[PDB]
Design a protein around this nucleic acid. Sequence first.
RNA 1: CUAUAUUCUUUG
Lengths: 75, 209, 151, 60, 57, 74, 202, 60, 72, 144, 145, 478
Amino acid sequence: FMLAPRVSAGGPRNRYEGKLVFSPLRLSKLLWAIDTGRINPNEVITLYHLRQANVVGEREIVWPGFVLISNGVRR
Amino acid sequence: VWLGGTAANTSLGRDVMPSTGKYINIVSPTDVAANISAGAMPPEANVAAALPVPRIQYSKWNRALRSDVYDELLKLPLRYKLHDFAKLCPPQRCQEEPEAVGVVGRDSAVGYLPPLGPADPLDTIPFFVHRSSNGVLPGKVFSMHPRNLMPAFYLRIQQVEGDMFRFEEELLKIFPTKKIFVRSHSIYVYNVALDGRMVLHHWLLGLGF
Amino acid sequence: RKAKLFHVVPGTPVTPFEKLKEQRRRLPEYRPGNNVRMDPNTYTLYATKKGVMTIRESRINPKYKWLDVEPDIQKVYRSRELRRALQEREMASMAVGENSNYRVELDLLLEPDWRERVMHVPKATERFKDPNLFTRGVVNELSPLDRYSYT
Amino acid sequence: LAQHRMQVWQLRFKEMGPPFSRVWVALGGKMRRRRVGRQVDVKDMRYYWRPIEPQYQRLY
Amino acid sequence: RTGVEWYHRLRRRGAYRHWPWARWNDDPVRQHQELSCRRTFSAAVTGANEGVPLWNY
Amino acid sequence: WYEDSSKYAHPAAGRRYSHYLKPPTERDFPATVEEYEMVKHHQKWHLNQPGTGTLLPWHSYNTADLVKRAAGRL
Amino acid sequence: NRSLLGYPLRRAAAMEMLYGGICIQHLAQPPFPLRKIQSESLPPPSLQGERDDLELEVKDSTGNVMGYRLFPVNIGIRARTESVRVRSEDCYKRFLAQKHCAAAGVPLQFPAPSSITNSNCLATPRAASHFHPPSSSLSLFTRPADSQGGDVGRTTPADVAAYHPRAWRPYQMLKPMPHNWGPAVRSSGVRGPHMQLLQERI
Amino acid sequence: VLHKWAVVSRSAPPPRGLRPIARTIPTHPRLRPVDYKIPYVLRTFIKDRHTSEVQHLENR
Amino acid sequence: NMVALRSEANTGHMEGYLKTETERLDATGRKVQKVLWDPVLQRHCLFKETKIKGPFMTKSAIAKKVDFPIGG
Amino acid sequence: DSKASFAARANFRLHAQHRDGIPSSSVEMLSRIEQVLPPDPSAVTFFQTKWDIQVQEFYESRGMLEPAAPLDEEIEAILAYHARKPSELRVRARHRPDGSTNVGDDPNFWAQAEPTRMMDGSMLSLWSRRTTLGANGVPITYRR
Amino acid sequence: DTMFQYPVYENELDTPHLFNITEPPDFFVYWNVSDFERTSYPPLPEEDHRLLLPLSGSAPWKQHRKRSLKYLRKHEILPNYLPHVRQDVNLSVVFPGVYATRARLCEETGEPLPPPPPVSRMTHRNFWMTAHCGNYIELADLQHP
Amino acid sequence: KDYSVASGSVDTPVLDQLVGYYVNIQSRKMYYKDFLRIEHQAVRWAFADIRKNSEALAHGLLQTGLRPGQRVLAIQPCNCETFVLQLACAKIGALLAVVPHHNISADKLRFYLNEFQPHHLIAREWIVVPEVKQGVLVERNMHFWDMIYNVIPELGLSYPGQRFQWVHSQEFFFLKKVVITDHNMNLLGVTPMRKMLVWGPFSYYEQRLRRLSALLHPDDPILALEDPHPALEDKLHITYSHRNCINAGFLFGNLMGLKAESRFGVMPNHHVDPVGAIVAPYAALTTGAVLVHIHSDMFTDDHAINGIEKLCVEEVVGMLGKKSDFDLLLRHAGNFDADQYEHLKWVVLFEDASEPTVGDEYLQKLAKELGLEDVFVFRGPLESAYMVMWRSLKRARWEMVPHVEAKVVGDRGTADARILAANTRGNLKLKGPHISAGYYNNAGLLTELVDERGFCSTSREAVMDERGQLTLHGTQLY
RNA sequence: CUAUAUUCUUUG
């Protein structure tokens, strides 16, 4: 590891305080939760409703909360 | 050294200019082509090369059924005939636009359906397969000895309940080559990864579960 | 020292990504032939196109060789294939130039005089032929710098 | 708990990949001693992320 | 044939696991399809160009 | 909230005091003879650009909290 | 027939020879002879010959060079590379819009309409022929908001002009600002706020 | 050479069409052609390059 | 010997250059200057000789204001 | 100038087996003309043309759909190359998509076009290669 | 000047100068706006061949025959679409062209321009309007039988 | 009124494709309909023609060596072809610099050659230029040819290899072809080696311009214009993109009104600034219309008279220009009959923001004199293609051009710089499709900031009024 | 490794 140089005195992927690292939330998962019946399409969906309906476990929640990704969902 | 030549002039679609006068006292691109001081530019450096684009992955949250995998199931001498492929896919888009559609068979982008029931009545399937609490089909792909991070995988099929051995014996026709074991709670299929999970889920969906 | 050797089986298809031969600076042992390039400094031979690599030996002095690469593989394949098939039926001639034993004889019966055409020294006047030939257009090329025959 | 993940690696490498295949990758040092009069090609063979040798990766 | 990696490409080991990266049964030239012209204007003469040799044979 | 409240400066302020909560002095011209001399020097330091009335520090923190986007889709 | 020097000698030299060292005679030289080319000896017209005769800069693996020469030099290099990547991607998106549009015979529009790409993803034999839309369907407006017109619904706030359906935002930001890092510099790069700054505790 | 997957990337290379690369006899005494004479030609210096390199031509 | 060729247009860009034995020779008191590709401008520029270790953008790299003949 | 006439006119070969879409009389006439002709032409001369507006008005006046020439493939591959992030082409794993392990000593392997999938490809020996097809019709690399 | 010469063919029957395109050598190129209405067809050949009786002993007919055949090979008509071409009759198919650059209309009406008189005899004005081997003709003048 | 920001109604469509696109479309729709008329060049062109010989000329430049990156320097005097060249350079992506010809020496020519470092130079042999005899403006015929030979003396020295030497002047090594545009009335053309091939198919398999147009993007700059009053010392020529031009012309075309083949004129010598170079011909293209050129020039009384006589024959429903030349018309307009102008309905003057405030009673003079229904006044800085705000004769209020934001901010931020108090001097920033953040300089193609909110710095200082009004100022020097 | 080099390039 001393043959390898340092990069970026923090380090390559490095956390710092207030780096924004979001836990991913796949639109696939969300839509599936809606069609399966965990969640209400009727009511505005907060992170709270996602946690209560259990679609995301506590270990996934960390600041800042979540990103919304579209994975394999074309509409 | 007088630097000149007819190579400075553009020539389009065929070069009809005399070939002795192209580069005069200047290195041609053929001279730098044979003289390059690096070596073997990588296969990714071919830009014109036409790369493949993967189809939409079958995930646990997204059921994307591929007609041809299903064809891999239909060629087989299975018993318990399968629903035709059209029925495993949810109703269409412009057909489901308004409120005229039923509640059970609702349109899903993901694609999701409650089980269809058996493709044929007047017949009794020997086993029954329970969906998850989220409505996922049973098989899980694990790794034998994950602490080493070993690429070799197996498939654990759990919620199967009924005669499990008849289940095993259809599972034989799907994976003729692989190794199979039964235990009261679950069925193991060795050397089969996510692909195998995709087939399995097609067969179970098409079986009416 | 290090050992410097072929990174591909000679007479086998090869991709541009591989080194063919690594030489050692002493004119080199192996010189670039058709579809082959050589590193100016390292003298390591790389293939340009993707093809079948073969070794050609100079008629003149057998200790100087070329690496060649044949662009289309299937030709070489169904050729060698038919050749072998015949070899086993005793239907093949041994008088072809692929045979190492016979190549000298083959070059001799084709061009009998090729020794003395090599030993021949053109005088200065026919090496250097008067430019106005090239200017009036009787000849389309002026090339004083090849006095030497590599064959 | 994390005693053995020490930062001299976390400054150097970065770990990359799909589960059950993960490289550790680092840049190559030839760099800051002699740049000049060498050649441009071998000089910028420096700037690529490369995987480390598998022995070392198993070791770390 | 000596050397480590020459031993690694015989027993086909980690870098070389699929060796020769160019083997027989690929041709960069014809893409394994037969070049012929069946496109003849009159359907009468369709095989008129046949066994036009690909090389000396 | 940006498009209504935030993006507008205090109705009193001019160019130089624009960023402050309420204009710190009355007149917008540099207030102290020292501050003024500093500004003159600044304007001839950078060659004469429009915004140079406001002093900017020559040095940077290089800290990730003050950085904005380099490039990308808008 | 043959000559001892193999070409007819030009009269100037001859007369200059037999009147020793004097050329006052023919000094007006006839133009050189022509070399005709056989146009049918030329090889058959090739497609790749047509692709590459122009010698564009886009077939390089180093990056999109044509993109670099069409772009402002003001921008610090490391942020300039990913800018050129953004235009070269936007050209891709546009390309695919033209493709899927011509595929369904629809007059072009771009970001892209959805129904086009998704329902043309539904046919394997639809890649054979393409048709032009009629000259009547052709319009100048390639944005959907100008094309589809108004539809009934909206979501985002009514007060903000930035949210307006027809509002126009520049497709990519351009900053003259320099980049903060390079691999050859030792302490270079961005630091966490409460990390020690560079040359700290000197 | 730096491909597009390296850590750093440079700007556009110099266009091949301008400021060409002269083909020059190797100055290295080992790599220099045997018969090549050291170029003494006693000559009134011509400063502008245009006329200067007409000298290296025989077009008459 | 090792010197730096820094662009006469001040982009601050420089290139390591090893003087030939003729320039290694003190026979002339002139700084070597050479036409090169300047990356920052994407153009051909003149380069001057300068000492390698030192700031490549000095206050002294400032050119005096020149009024250009073009326009009004 | 009719429709059916055009359909027949575009697919024409000289001696056909059967011919459809046209009225019977024309078919009979054509059969005669072909019977009288040899397979071999006694003079051949040919010219070349380029598109113009008169083309449009030929399809539009008759209410047909004027064909369009398809965009170029190589341009699409070039664009799709330059579009992707620089990290698309870096090495993302221990193993090339072929399944070979790449040690990092060699610069040919420092780049990777296709993502490597370690959990895919176990079924291919039991399946038809039609399964390997990508979205664009090209076979994707599976670990073997 | 053997190495520097502008390309000159002896038969433009393929109209090669339209496709194979060499940069004007000259440093000063003269381009008006007036030449967009000029039509660039190749200069009239000597020995107009359309009048040649195809006698099997005649030199010019033999040479033109083999020219045409070579052209027919280079555009991949001959071996490909038309495997056997027995060239006997000397064929000229001509079109009634005005040498009009684009499609035009009437100023007095806005009608399509009236169909031209069918060509009676072959003239020099009529030459490039025919079908030789591979040459180019504007679409605008191919509009009639 | 309260805070200094100004916005136009965003309801009008924006044209985001390349220029070649709209040229092809307009070509398919109206093929035979007219596009631009010029009597003195005998040029009557339909959209057929503009397309056909646009891309024809493009192939011409391709075969003369031009490639997507580089630049073209053009000294041409109010021709048809400077516009054709715009389209051509647009198609191959080459930046076309148009520089004003009226004061031109060997010196500033050599300056331009050092700055743009152009691959092509489009010039003349003889060019007409105004100069002062006895305090009176008269046409002179300048020999530009002589100039070119002054700047590049090496073309005079001819050895018989030299046509093919690799670099023609060791001074400017980037200079390759010089295109001479002059009308020669002899019926025989020039020999094929001093002429570029402009006609017929250029290929076999596919036309390479449409292969290339896939690699071009609407915001790639193609144009450069000289700014008489540079905002900074730095900004010399300001630069436009496809998007900028097409949208400038479409906004002008829409805002007035324009109907297919209604006739619309332009006063000469405006091809060097975004009136004749950008707004006029792209207006004529985007909305079906017919552009009309009057006499080739303006400054002399004689061809002002000649000009009017032409404009009454040509049936112009309305025409464009600047105040400076409308003075010339005003002088000699009295010499004609009130009813000669009856086809003229509206007129337009464009105004740089450093003029300030064209007087309205002057407009009144214009309208009463030419029997004009209406006079329109457009105003903005040069990066706006002279349109930010506009007013009529009947409406004195300044309305914003649709899709334009003008705001004056403080000095302490970039994206987040705060709007000022609506009387205060501060930094002016523009946002709009036809606004350009690009500019050209001795260094190359440069850009100033285009931020996350979408605006872009003009590096100009300005004052907003309570009613919609902008006033430019130089950098504040305290 | 620490300093000096702060645009793509550079020292011990």
